Design an enzyme around this catalytic site. Structure first.
Site, PDB file in Angstrom:
ATOM      1  N   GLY B  24       0.828  -1.192   0.000  1.00 41.19           N
ATOM      2  CA  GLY B  24       0.000   0.000   0.000  1.00 41.19           C
ATOM      3  C   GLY B  24       0.862   1.241   0.000  1.00 41.19           C
ATOM      4  O   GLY B  24       2.095   1.174  -0.037  1.00 41.19           O
ATOM      5  N   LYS B  42       3.633  -4.725   9.835  1.00 36.63           N
ATOM      6  CA  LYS B  42       3.508  -3.622   8.893  1.00 36.63           C
ATOM      7  C   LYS B  42       4.759  -2.760   8.960  1.00 36.63           C
ATOM      8  O   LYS B  42       5.153  -2.308  10.041  1.00 36.63           O
ATOM      9  CB  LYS B  42       2.257  -2.790   9.179  1.00 36.63           C
ATOM     10  CG  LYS B  42       1.241  -3.479  10.069  1.00 36.63           C
ATOM     11  CD  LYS B  42       0.121  -4.071   9.222  1.00 36.63           C
ATOM     12  CE  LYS B  42      -1.016  -4.609  10.073  1.00 36.63           C
ATOM     13  NZ  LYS B  42      -2.180  -5.082   9.268  1.00 36.63           N
ATOM     14  N   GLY B 139      -5.730 -11.743  11.551  1.00 38.69           N
ATOM     15  CA  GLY B 139      -7.166 -11.547  11.519  1.00 38.69           C
ATOM     16  C   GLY B 139      -7.898 -12.493  10.594  1.00 38.69           C
ATOM     17  O   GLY B 139      -9.066 -12.811  10.827  1.00 38.69           O
ATOM     18  N   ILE B 141      -8.701 -13.713   6.335  1.00 37.36           N
ATOM     19  CA  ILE B 141      -8.746 -13.337   4.928  1.00 37.36           C
ATOM     20  C   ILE B 141      -9.775 -12.231   4.750  1.00 37.36           C
ATOM     21  O   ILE B 141     -10.828 -12.237   5.397  1.00 37.36           O
ATOM     22  CB  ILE B 141      -9.074 -14.546   4.032  1.00 37.36           C
ATOM     23  CG1 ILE B 141      -8.190 -15.734   4.404  1.00 37.36           C
ATOM     24  CG2 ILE B 141      -8.873 -14.196   2.572  1.00 37.36           C
ATOM     25  CD1 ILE B 141      -8.797 -17.071   4.062  1.00 37.36           C
ATOM     26  N   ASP B 180     -13.600   4.437   6.551  1.00 39.28           N
ATOM     27  CA  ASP B 180     -12.972   3.750   5.422  1.00 39.28           C
ATOM     28  C   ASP B 180     -13.314   2.266   5.417  1.00 39.28           C
ATOM     29  O   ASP B 180     -12.450   1.417   5.176  1.00 39.28           O
ATOM     30  CB  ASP B 180     -11.455   3.930   5.439  1.00 39.28           C
ATOM     31  CG  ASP B 180     -11.012   5.217   4.784  1.00 39.28           C
ATOM     32  OD1 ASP B 180     -11.758   5.744   3.936  1.00 39.28           O
ATOM     33  OD2 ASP B 180      -9.912   5.703   5.115  1.00 39.28           O
ATOM     34  N   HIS B 182     -14.132  -0.078   3.443  1.00 37.39           N
ATOM     35  CA  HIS B 182     -14.241  -0.743   2.155  1.00 37.39           C
ATOM     36  C   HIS B 182     -14.089  -2.247   2.350  1.00 37.39           C
ATOM     37  O   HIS B 182     -13.475  -2.714   3.313  1.00 37.39           O
ATOM     38  CB  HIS B 182     -13.213  -0.210   1.151  1.00 37.39           C
ATOM     39  CG  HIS B 182     -11.813  -0.140   1.676  1.00 37.39           C
ATOM     40  ND1 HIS B 182     -10.924  -1.187   1.568  1.00 37.39           N
ATOM     41  CD2 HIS B 182     -11.138   0.862   2.287  1.00 37.39           C
ATOM     42  CE1 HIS B 182      -9.766  -0.837   2.099  1.00 37.39           C
ATOM     43  NE2 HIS B 182      -9.870   0.400   2.544  1.00 37.39           N
ATOM     44  N   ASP B 218      -6.874  -0.826   9.295  1.00 38.59           N
ATOM     45  CA  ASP B 218      -6.511   0.314   8.444  1.00 38.59           C
ATOM     46  C   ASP B 218      -7.258   1.591   8.849  1.00 38.59           C
ATOM     47  O   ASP B 218      -8.136   2.092   8.145  1.00 38.59           O
ATOM     48  CB  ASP B 218      -6.741  -0.008   6.965  1.00 38.59           C
ATOM     49  CG  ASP B 218      -5.894   0.848   6.047  1.00 38.59           C
ATOM     50  OD1 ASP B 218      -4.903   1.435   6.530  1.00 38.59           O
ATOM     51  OD2 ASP B 218      -6.220   0.935   4.846  1.00 38.59           O
TER      52      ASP B 218
END
Lengths: 135, 329, 110, 98, 97, 83, 83, 109, 96
Positions: B24, B42, B139, B141, B180, B182, B218
DNA sequence: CCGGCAATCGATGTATATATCTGACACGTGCCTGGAGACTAGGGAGTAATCCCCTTGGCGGTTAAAACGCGGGGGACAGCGCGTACGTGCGTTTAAGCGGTGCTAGAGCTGTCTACGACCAATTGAGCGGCCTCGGCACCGGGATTCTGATGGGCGG
DNA sequence: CCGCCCATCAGAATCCCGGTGCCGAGGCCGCTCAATTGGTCGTAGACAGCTCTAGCACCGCTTAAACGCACGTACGCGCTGTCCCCCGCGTTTTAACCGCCAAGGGGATTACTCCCTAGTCTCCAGGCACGTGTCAGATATATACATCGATTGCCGG
């Protein structure tokens, strides 16, 4: 879903490289017609092809809505304001198809017995008379 | 301490077991096993002069609110007034100095070979480059890759109920706006517990699980308040976020901006509501289910979800939707 | 006291079809006033034998076609190709069965 | 010059004559012997009543007469007046019996 | 559990199938056809046996009636095997009672 | 609501398809009317028996069971429809 | 006392008389063998069923009731000989 | 003092027995119970059919200048009527014969 | 030692014949034929009525079953006359 | 100057009229077993109320199948000629049919008595009805391969 | 100079893979109630003995039917010619199919009477077995009468 939309950098044509990278072109014969001669099968060939095709499948050979309308129209003579389940009409159609196919087999045998290839109404009459259906 | 070498935070055992999971704008996301537990790492490049992946490097004083809200949402799982396990817990966050070890480089190469990437190769960074590393639980998939894997509409209802309960608890406790959701940002994990327990303002309730557990990730553009102080990032000057097209998700940002008059500092929970909308939209349009709808009970619940979708725009916040709409009663 | 557990009559006869249900159906069908203790066993054995025969032939036909499930076409093919079973079900129609491929010799091209 | 009938006259006379009476047209002793010989295979040392043999003969003759009527219809269908074994075979095939 | 229960022969047919062909399945329409077949044969044999018992001025149905009905109804080379199977089953049941 | 002239819905290509499944090569031009007549007779008999069965049970709907019973009575058993 | 060669007792004139009652005017020369064969098959079936009934009844004599029952079972009901 | 008995056929005004039919229905393994109106209906139907056949056969016998009915007359009556011929379509009458009938093409020119 | 008596339908057939044609006799073979005819028809109607009763989960045979079986078994005509005769007989019986 | 159409002329097989003779059918009698009268107990069938599933009816889009026209090749149908298989008739041979005589195997009935099936009470586990998951089977699309039909170009007694 | 064969060409038919959409096995609970276990009890049928009907075997005599052979003609079968009428293929027009959605009619389940059928006992009239005549039908003889096949006898192109 990275919070933004871009082009297609995420995937390097994976589906194409996995399959149909360039195989998606032409198949079978590429040249057809283009001849003054009117290409034609002789009579009796497509008939045998149809005979071989329909003796291998199993689906029904009559449109459903006309048959259902005919069944309701016939039934309204004996009693008015009737109702039907779907499976009742389905069973009627199956029985009708089987009966007609067997009758046509017997008719074909009768036609061949008389040294012909075409079936005529007299063959149906003789088949039904010998079968005992018609006195 | 401070910018410690990557070797301290990433031993050779963890370095060899890293599996590329994502990329990302922020950086890269890997998976390994540590402490007998699968953990996600991350990695972000910070405080650099160079431009990478079409954007300049990010500093520390703007990444501080990110870790603050992350730790807050991780610790809200232990409060007694409002408890919910819909987020990801914090393992460790630290700073690194050095370059990229070749092991993750070849893992990235394999990731590109199988799936592909939308960024550049991270091999231009020298020793002096500074990095941040965040450790999170595994977490599962994402819902995007599970599109042809859902069982039936009951799983759908359970997912929506869990999301609504978690968001309602967040709003009631810490007045949270994440903005966010999504469908590539929720995670599904297999579980054995038959029921899930949630507490709001001291009252406890249970939800059927149907063999799944959902989580959210995120939080890079989220807003929160605590003890009269607000934390968020003002994004009122970059309009490329609002120039999107091709999906109603691209329009949700514009609609939210219209709702709040381009003022990001205000608390408007109604925004989150439309986010549910979009998910519900996806749940009715972009999913394939194993089981047909031949059962009358499933027909009934499908009608219930349809009515919920067509009439939920009239509610105020997540708590109102949870405690008023007939779907959850 | 203890009544020494239980044991279905099918287990003692070594069958797979139910024996009690057949007895109950014979008693309530108005066939005769009294029913012996050996008739249900005989009937269950006969029915099981016939079922096994037909199923085996149908499974062979299905495997020939490279399919792992039996459908009515395979039952029709199995029945019509065996003389004895064909004579037994000589006045029965199977739904979605079709016919046996067969063309007379006179109609074939020269 | 001796008197002679043309081919077909006596046949029609006999057709009319045998369609008016109601008797049995097969001799009884040969039929009884045939019945016993056929039954010999299924069981040994059997006995019959008289009415059993009579019933068997009646049923057999009825069956044969009906079959011959069907055969005549089939033969006429093909522009002939003589009956040939192919007609019997076609009649039996259509009627259902093997 | 609101609807009244309905009985069929599905379980036993599946057991027999899995015993003969260990790695084959079956579809619902074939199951219906098999159920109808079993019911039809049961009815035929029972009716023949009842008529036989009535002819002889008896008031009970025994295994002799079933055996003679099977001999009368099934064609050759199918009657013999069925007779053998039924006799074996009856003997085993009697010995172990 | 009275239906009229629905036997014409049994088209000519449908009769041709049935004949092809029967194994017939050449069809004359006067066969279609004969087929329509015999089909009408068959349907009349079966539906009359089924409606009698339905009426006796003081019911107002024709079910698959009545059709199966009528077919069995005529001498043409049918497997697969709730038999 | 074994019996052999009795199918020849169905002479040619007997078959001619049966045909004349059937309404036949001209006959081939190969018809008699076919008639003898079909008669033999018919008799075999009926006699087998009758003997099965007799054997179940535990007798050594075949009665008229056995013949009547066998004929009715095959679908050829006969009136007149009792039953 | 029992009243003098009156048979059930007399009350129904029939000629066929009603008690015998009731007994045959009961001891025949048809159903568990038999109602009180079934024997009357069955006896009436049987008597009607018998009368029909007998009248036709007697007419045929008189046409032949006789005074006693033999099986030939029963066959002639049954085969010359459409409904009876359809009902008894698979039945053989002993010593009955056939109906006189010759195909038209066989006739001499 | 006694000879067991056997029952038939000859008396009633003779009564009906004398009712219809008052000057006509009958022979023995014809009597046997009519006996068999009556037995056959009785069996057909009774069997159909029993099957009809069993289809509806009922335990008794009434006149409705007989009427429906008659309408099911008999051809086009001979079915109205039989129904009328049966209804008349039942009404007359129940009135007395 | 015949090929015909009608009108005889003889012979053969079937229908019709009158007299004798019999055995199968129409009644009369005595007896006994199966049906009618009288009464009670209880459970199957009828009726009302309620729920909710499935049948009828409507609307719009698309496209696959039905309807139509035309050229021409192959099959149905009539006419003709030829050869032999089937019908009619006579003389001779064979076994069915009828009428008695004699024997006994087995069907049909009665009386005794035991063992197998019906019925009941207490106990319990098989089988079906809701809710739910999911691994792989069937299906489609494309492309390649094959196979078959309809054709012209040729050596030859 | 009639050909009867081979090599090419094009168009269906069948295989191989890759991706999608759902079905058929199973997992759990929860009952319901039907099958199993252990008793008593009344009667259906197995068994043994006896009587006498009817099925089997043989013999002699008559007469009708079955059998073999001769002769001739009408029917079956193959071949040729002609013309109609179904088949294959392209173009245009109709309505079947799919998906979705309300409205409500009728089938299915629950509870409560209560009248109709089975069961029992007593008694006598209908229906069955047996025995006698007499008359409808069977048999014998003579007598027309309708029809088939050959011959005569003129007859118009």
């Amino acid at each position: 879903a990275r919070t933004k939309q871009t082009a297609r950098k995420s995937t390097g044509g994976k589906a194409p490289r996995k399959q149909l990278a360039t195989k998606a072109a032409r198949k079978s014969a590429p040249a057809t017609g283009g001849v003054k001669k009117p290409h034609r099968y002789r009579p009796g060939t497509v008939a045998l092809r149809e005979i071989r095709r329909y003796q291998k499948s199993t689906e029904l050979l009559i449109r459903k809505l006309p048959f259902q309308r005919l069944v309701r129209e016939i039934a309204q003579d004996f009693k008015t304001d009737l109702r039907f389940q779907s499976s009742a009409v389905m069973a009627l159609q199956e029985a009708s198809e089987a009966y007609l196919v067997a009758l046509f087999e017997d008719t074909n045998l009768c036609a061949i017995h008389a040294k012909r290839v075409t079936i005529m109404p007299k063959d149906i009459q003789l088949a039904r008379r010998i079968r005992g259906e018609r006195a | 301490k401070g910018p410690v070498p990557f070797s301290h935070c990433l031993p050779t055992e963890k370095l060899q077991r890293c599996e590329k999971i994502g990329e990302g704008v922020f950086g890269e996301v890997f998976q390994t096993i540590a402490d007998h537990t699968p953990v996600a790492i991350k990695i972000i490049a910070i405080e650099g002069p160079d431009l990478v992946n079409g954007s300049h490097q990010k500093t520390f004083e703007e990444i501080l609110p990110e870790i603050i809200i992350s730790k807050e949402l991780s610790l809200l799982s232990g409060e007694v007034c409002n408890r919910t396990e819909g987020f990801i817990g914090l393992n460790s966050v630290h700073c690194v100095q050095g370059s990229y070890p070749p092991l993750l480089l070849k893992a990235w190469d394999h990731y590109n070979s199988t799936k592909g990437s939308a960024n550049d190769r991270p091999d231009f960074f020298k020793d002096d480059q500074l990095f941040i590393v965040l450790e999170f639980e595994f977490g599962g998939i994402d819902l995007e890759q599970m599109r042809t894997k859902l069982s039936s509409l009951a799983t759908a209802k359970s997912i929506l109920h869990q999301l609504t309960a978690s968001l309602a608890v967040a709003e009631a406790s810490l007045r949270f706006e994440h903005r966010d959701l999504h469908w590539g940002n929720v995670l599904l994990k297999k579980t054995s517990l038959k029921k899930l327990h949630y507490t709001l303002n001291g009252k406890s309730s249970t939800i059927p699980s149907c063999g799944l557990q959902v989580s959210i990730i995120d939080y890079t553009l989220s807003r929160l308040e605590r003890d009269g102080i607000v934390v968020f990032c003002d994004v009122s000057m970059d309009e490329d976020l609002f120039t999107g097209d091709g999906d109603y998700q691209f329009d949700i940002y514009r609609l939210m901006k219209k709702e709040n008059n381009n003022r990001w500092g205000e608390y408007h929970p109604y925004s989150n509501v439309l986010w549910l909308h979009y998910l519900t939209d996806k749940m009715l349009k972009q999913m394939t289910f194993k089981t047909k709808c031949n059962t009358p009970a499933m027909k009934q619940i499908k009608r219930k979800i349809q009515e919920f979708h067509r009439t939920m725009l009239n509610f105020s916040s997540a708590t109102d939707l949870l405690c008023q709409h007939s779907l959850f009663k | 006291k203890t009544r020494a557990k239980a044991k279905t009559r099918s287990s003692r006869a070594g069958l797979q079809f139910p024996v009690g249900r057949v007895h109950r159906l014979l008693r309530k069908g108005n066939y005769a006033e009294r029913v012996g203790a050996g008739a249900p066993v005989y009937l269950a054995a006969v029915l099981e034998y016939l079922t096994a025969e037909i199923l085996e032939l149908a499974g062979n036909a299905a495997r020939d076609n490279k399919k792992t499930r039996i459908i009515p076409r395979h039952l029709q093919l199995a029945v019509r190709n065996d003389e004895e079973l064909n004579k037994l079900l000589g006045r029965v129609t199977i739904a979605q069965g079709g016919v046996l491929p067969n063309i007379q010799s006179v109609l074939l091209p020269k | 010059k001796p008197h002679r009938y043309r081919p077909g006259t006596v046949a029609l006379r006999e057709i009319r004559r045998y369609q008016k009476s109601t008797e049995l047209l097969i001799r009884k002793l040969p039929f009884q012997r045939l019945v016993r010989e056929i039954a010999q295979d299924f069981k040994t040392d059997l006995r019959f009543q008289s009415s059993a043999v009579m019933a068997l003969q009646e049923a057999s003759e009825a069956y044969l007469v009906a079959l011959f009527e069907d055969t005549n219809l089939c033969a006429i269908h093909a522009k002939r007046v003589t009956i040939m074994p192919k007609d019997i075979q076609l009649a039996r095939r259509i009627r259902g019996e093997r | 559990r609101r609807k009244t229960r309905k009985e069929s022969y599905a379980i036993y047919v599946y057991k027999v199938l899995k015993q003969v062909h260990p790695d084959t399945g079956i579809s619902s329409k074939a199951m219906s056809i098999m159920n109808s077949f079993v019911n039809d044969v049961f009815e035929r044999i029972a009716g023949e046996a009842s008529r036989l018992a009535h002819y002889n001025k008896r008031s009970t149905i025994t295994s002799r009636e079933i055996q003679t009905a099977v001999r009368l109804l099934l064609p050759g080379e199918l009657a013999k095997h069925a007779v053998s199977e039924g006799t074996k089953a009856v003997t085993k049941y009697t010995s172990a009672k | 609501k009275v239906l009229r002239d629905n036997i014409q819905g049994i088209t000519k290509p449908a009769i041709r398809r049935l004949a092809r499944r029967g194994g017939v090569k050449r069809i004359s031009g006067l066969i279609y009317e004969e087929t329509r007549g015999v089909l009408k007779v068959f349907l009349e008999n079966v539906i009359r028996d089924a409606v009698t069965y339905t009426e006796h049970a003081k019911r107002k709907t024709v079910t698959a069971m009545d059709v199966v019973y009528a077919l069995k009575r005529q001498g043409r058993t049918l497997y697969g429809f709730g038999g």
